[PDB]
Symmetry: C3
Subunit: 117 residues, 3 copies
């Protein structure tokens, strides 16, 4: 049913984001988002997406998100398509009342397009 | 905990109705099924360099009633972009569904397609 | 979407699919609460497959082939890779047979990169 499909595709787009869109935002210096790296601290220190902050997945709570503005949209990302980090983390953020959005592809897809930091 | 039998069944069934894979699409084209219209959402230049067989060119931010008036709403539209990192197919799928077409996005895009027919 | 809508979306998604890591940990611990099923052809399964997995080709899933399987366990289907539908299609048939199914996103392809099947 055309309408059912429209809502499906629309919602899907509201839950996830791709490398291109995220890439453009960071280059434009968008202040409306907060790119969060769900990987371990060590992985983040070796390299990570530009302007991204570090907040390991099983460490997401109100103590680590108190300084984050609920006025911005959180964008989580893990290693790649084989990881759940971004989705899991997205849940914890949405549960803490944040406007979360997972980055499908993670660092893996990002590397192929853009450069790490 | 995973999901309930019935809930799961509906989930997997719906998912299958929204997306298609390389194999299924490949079979349809091979035996030249006139019940689908494979549309390439990438830029015109990308489509001219190479594209999936029997696919037509209709750039994403160019999908409207002027470009879909010659397309039969009796057929199922199948959009596809570059690969998993692209939104083109999903975005385009929305515009088609909004124009009253029976749309279906191709998960994987050209990237996955290349790996299979070669 | 609104925080709550998102939470339910991500939660449900996690209940329908599983990743290499999680599945990997379960097998290594020798969990008896899951049944890893290979949806690929019999020949593909005999050449190599994920450890402790059983063989049940997709278009062969019915009550005759699932009568010996415990509905007390969670079925985990898997095909070749991201470009395949096997896992999703099979998942539907299992959920339809009243099983607590869960598809493995990535298939053998993703599993190889991490772990070393038998």
């Amino acid at each position: 049913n055309p309408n059912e499909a429209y809502r499906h595709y629309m919602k899907k787009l509201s839950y996830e984001t791709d490398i291109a869109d995220l890439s453009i935002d960071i280059k434009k210096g968008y202040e409306g988002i907060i790119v969060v790296d769900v990987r371990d601290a060590e992985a983040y220190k070796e390299c990570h997406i530009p302007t991204a902050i570090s907040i390991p997945g099983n460490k997401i709570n109100e103590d680590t998100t108190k300084r984050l503005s609920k006025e911005k949209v959180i964008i989580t990302y893990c290693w790649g398509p084989a990881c759940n980090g971004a989705t899991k983390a997205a849940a914890k953020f949405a549960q803490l009342g944040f406007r979360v959005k997972e980055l499908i592809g993670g660092i893996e897809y990002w590397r192929k397009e853009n450069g790490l930091e």
